[PDB]
Design a protein around this ligand. Sequence first.
Ligand SMILES: Cc1cc2nc3c(=O)[nH]c(=O)nc-3n(C[C@H](O)[C@H](O)[C@H](O)COP(=O)(O)OP(=O)(O)OC[C@H]3O[C@@H](n4cnc5c(N)ncnc54)[C@H](O)[C@@H]3O)c2cc1C
Length: 260
Amino acid sequence: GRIHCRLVAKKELSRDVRLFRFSLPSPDQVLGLPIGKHIFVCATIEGKLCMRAYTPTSMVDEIGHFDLLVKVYFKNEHPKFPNGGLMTQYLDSLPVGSYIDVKGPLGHVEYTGRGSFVINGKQRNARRLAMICGGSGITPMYQIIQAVLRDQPEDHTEMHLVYANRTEDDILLRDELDRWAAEYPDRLKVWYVIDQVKRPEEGWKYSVGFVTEAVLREHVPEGGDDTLALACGPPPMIQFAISPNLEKMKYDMANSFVVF
Ligand SMILES: Cc1cc2nc3c(=O)[nH]c(=O)nc-3n(C[C@H](O)[C@H](O)[C@H](O)COP(=O)(O)OP(=O)(O)OC[C@H]3O[C@@H](n4cnc5c(N)ncnc54)[C@H](O)[C@@H]3O)c2cc1C
């Protein structure tokens, strides 16, 4: 349930990317966040208590603190969202030493073990996972990815990740993903897509643009049953760019398609 965490440290991974390390009040504990679930960092900004979901990037076994990879939505940055992000600017504003209120565990998805899943109460299993995401929608996915690989080589669940962004300077857990991809070729397949190539000179070898059926066709596995699909991305993307294409790839939308 509710827990009071102090912001122990902050890290600027890039102009708009921070890594915040929060301490739990009892230094001998882990944040027992079951895989597939998130926490709410609650805070009262101005006059309302804001509630935002975040899925930590730290090991399930991390004693004493948990980390959040937060993509800061600054103001004076977007045509349509001129005043930036609420909670993200609030957290970026916090000086280290400050207190935060985490509510958890929330969620409907849980990765109980080996291919096994617990969605909205029901229990299921999968052998091939189709993880399609965009931006920070990667953290929920990176939690399962870390779980499966941790349970290696017994939990040999097959993962196919399609990670979409806008720039190569925007791929979040890149090195981590590249690093794993090299180690567990059999387990995880990684494919990036990017709206633009900031430094094409260096030679971008993945897809350029948006998520297309041609991309899903060659990077997500075949639909059917025993092939689960999980997706966490902005509304329009889940919308236009994903569900129809996966429908076209014969994935039962109901019993086989989930969004975080
Ligand atoms: C399961 C789950 C896990 C999540 N995990 C994480 C996580 O691990 N890490 C993480 O960082 N995020 C995560 N999120 C995202 C989180 O829900 C927030 O919505 C995100 O923090 C932004 O919140 P905010 O209060 O700053 O924005 P809000 O004030 O709610 O506004 C968001 C909207 O404004 C737009 N916007 C405003 N300014 C800009 C700008 N400068 N550039 C681009 N768009 C702009 C955004 O595009 C978005 O459409 C997760 C969400 C869920 C559902």
